[PDB]
């Protein structure tokens, strides 16, 4: 049963991430439908990031007080309710219903990203703890990819509002059915199971570690760049490539899939050899190089040089993500991995909000190129900061005991 739980959690986190990116994947179509500017539809993606921060601590308290069964049940139930609430928005003048459904979905997310560590800890031993967490993360990333690919094929950019409403209805039905099925699966399979047998202080100890602070800032930069790029991919891509929404979705799918492949490669490299600082430095440098190449080859007229560049940049830009968590645990082994992962995630959300809003404004007022140079400048600053990191690998030193 232990793997049924993982395969259900991965699937419904996938559904939640699809619900995150379904709007930014067809940003322009939704703009036309609801009649709102790009900024308003841009906020249906920053709702997740904004809601993640304040609700993280209550989520941890609820987990520690009630157990994993009820947390997973609540996450799936909120995901289903948020998915089905949006069905009241199938009209040009009901954007508030959508931005309420997305809020309910975002509240569900907070019960997702922190679970996989505990799921692996409670359902798996040492020989299988890593694989469960990796599978959950890959499920979430595949959710992002599917949300990038499916909407533009299920929602053609037709001028008529009624036919567009019908297509959006089809998409929301296909997501609500999945959410309901996965909620049933969570109620059935996600049986409660106990193990066989401070936070302020721990956070103070961590922040006393300047290396962890530098890692937090660098991970925030990278993850926020990824989130802003994912949210704004439709806006920039369609500007230079009119009437290519499906190809924008395919570009997003390529970015995310190359990201999963790079994450696998980086995980294997770290497991085989223990070089963390060098791996992170090279990953960040290659992410910066890919970002500059993507920025300065996007406006060339051929997706021949856009698919390849987006894939080869997203490869590293997303392989850095699990690597950041691993480096954080290595730097701060004595403290719980949950707190470090939570702080890295919070930094990611904050920098993602900042990057998304700033780059959206820059695209609106200055063009795509100034926004991409803004992102590239921030990414190179992050790369320099990471290169200025001293690797006091506590996990390796501690495990070297005997």
By CB under 6 A, name the binding residues for ligand CHT: 17, 20, 48-49, 52, 109, 140, 227, 349
Rounded least distance, CB 17 to ligand CHT, Å: 5
| Closest residue by beta carbon to ligand CHT | 48
Q: Are 227 and 355 in contact (CB under 8 A)?
A: yes
Rank residues 140 and 380 by Cβ distance to ligand CHT and give the closer one: 140
227 in a known ligand binding site: yes
Q: Within a 10 A sphere around the Cβ of 65, how many other Cβ atoms?
A: 9
Rounded least distance, CB 93 to ligand CHT, Å: 28
94 in a known ligand binding site: no
Rounded least distance, CB 273 to ligand CHT, Å: 28
Rounded least distance, CB 306 to ligand CHT, Å: 22
Q: How far apart are CA 3 and CA 243, in angstroms?
A: 42
Rank residues 52 and 374 by Cβ distance to ligand CHT and give the closer one: 52
Half-sphere exposure of 316 (CA within 13 A, CB side): 18
Rank residues 47 and 185 by Cβ distance to ligand CHT and give the closer one: 47
Rank residues 20 and 33 by Cβ distance to ligand CHT and give the closer one: 20
Rank residues 8 and 292 by Cβ distance to ligand CHT and give the closer one: 8
118 in a known ligand binding site: no
State the Cα angle at 199 between 193 and 203, rounded to 5°. 130
Rank residues 50 and 285 by Cβ distance to ligand CHT and give the closer one: 50
Rounded least distance, CB 130 to ligand CHT, Å: 19
Rank residues 292 and 339 by Cβ distance to ligand CHT and give the closer one: 339
Phi, psi (degrees; rounded to nearest 5) at 124: -140, 155
Rounded least distance, CB 45 to ligand CHT, Å: 8
Contacts 24+ apart (CB under 8 A), 182-187: 182/8, 182/11, 182/12, 182/15, 182/76, 182/79, 182/80, 183/12, 183/76, 183/77, 183/79, 183/80, 185/8, 185/11, 185/12, 186/8, 186/12, 186/72, 186/73, 186/76, 187/73, 187/76
Q: Within a 10 A sphere around the Cβ of 87, how many other Cβ atoms?
A: 16
Rounded least distance, CB 352 to ligand CHT, Å: 7
Pull the structure tokens for residue 402: 């005997």
Q: How far apart are CA 383 and CA 222, in angstroms?
A: 9
Rank residues 321 and 383 by Cβ distance to ligand CHT and give the closer one: 321
Rounded least distance, CB 141 to ligand CHT, Å: 8
Q: How far apart are CA 244 and CA 255, in angstroms?
A: 16
Nearest to 123 by CA among 53, 72, 185: 72
Distance of CA 301 to the CA centre of its chain: 29
2 in a known ligand binding site: yes
For the chain, the maximum distance between any two Cα atoms, rounded to a whole number of angstroms, is 70
19 in a known ligand binding site: no
27 in a known ligand binding site: no
22 in a known ligand binding site: no
In this structure, what DSSP letter does residue 92 have?
A: T
Q: How far apart are CA 8 and CA 5, in angstroms?
A: 5
Sign of CA dihedral 139, 141, 144, 147: negative
1 in a known ligand binding site: yes
Q: How far apart are CA 164 and CA 141, in angstroms?
A: 27
Residue ranges of the annotated binding site for choline are: 16, 20, 109, 113, 227, 349
Residue ranges of the annotated binding site for heme b are: 1-2
């Amino acid at each position: 049963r232990r793997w049924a739980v993982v395969l259900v959690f991965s699937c419904y986190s996938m559904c939640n991430s699809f619900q995150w990116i379904q709007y930014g994947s067809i940003n322009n179509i939704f703009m036309h439908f609801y009649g709102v500017s790009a900024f308003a539809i841009d906020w249906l993606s920053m709702c997740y990031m904004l809601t993640y921060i304040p609700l993280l601590l209550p989520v941890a308290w609820l987990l520690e007080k009630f157990g994993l069964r009820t947390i997973a049940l609540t996450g799936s139930a909120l995901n289903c309710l948020g998915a089905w609430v949006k069905l009241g928005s199938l009209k040009p003048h009901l954007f508030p219903v959508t931005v309420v459904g997305q809020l309910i979905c975002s509240v569900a997310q907070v019960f997702i990203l922190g679970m996989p560590s505990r799921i692996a800890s409670v359902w798996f031993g040492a020989n299988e703890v890593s694989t469960a967490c990796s599978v959950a993360v890959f499920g979430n990333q595949l959710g992002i990819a599917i949300g990038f690919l499916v909407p533009p094929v299920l929602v053609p950019n037709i001028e008529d509002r009624d036919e567009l409403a019908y297509h959006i209805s089809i998409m929301f039905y296909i997501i609500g059915g999945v959410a309901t099925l996965l909620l049933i699966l969570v109620i059935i399979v996600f049986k409660e199971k106990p193990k066989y047998p401070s936070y302020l202080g721990s956070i103070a100890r961590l922040f006393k570690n300047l290396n962890f602070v530098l890692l937090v800032i660098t991970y925030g930069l990278n993850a926020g760049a990824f989130y802003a790029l994912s949210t704004l991919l439709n806006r920039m891509v369609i500007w230079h490539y009119p009437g290519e929404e499906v190809n924008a979705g395919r570009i997003g799918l390529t970015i995310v899939i190359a990201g999963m492949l790079g994450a696998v490669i980086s995980g294997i490299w770290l497991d085989r050899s223990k070089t963390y600082k060098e791996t992170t430095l090279v990953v960040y440098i290659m992410t910066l190089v890919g970002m500059v190449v993507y920025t300065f080859t996007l406006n060339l007229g051929h997706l021949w040089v856009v698919f390849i560049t987006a894939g080869t940049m997203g490869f590293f830009m997303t392989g850095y993500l699990p690597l950041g968590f691993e480096f954080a645990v290595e730097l701060t082994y004595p403290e719980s991995e949950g707190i470090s992962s939570g702080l890295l995630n919070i930094s990611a959300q904050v920098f993602g909000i900042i990057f998304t809003i700033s780059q959206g404004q820059i695209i609106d007022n200055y063009g795509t190129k100034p926004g991409n140079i803004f992102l590239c400048v921030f990414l190179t600053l992050g790369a320099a900061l990471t290169a200025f990191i001293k690797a006091d690998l506590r996990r390796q030193k501690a495990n070297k005991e005997t």
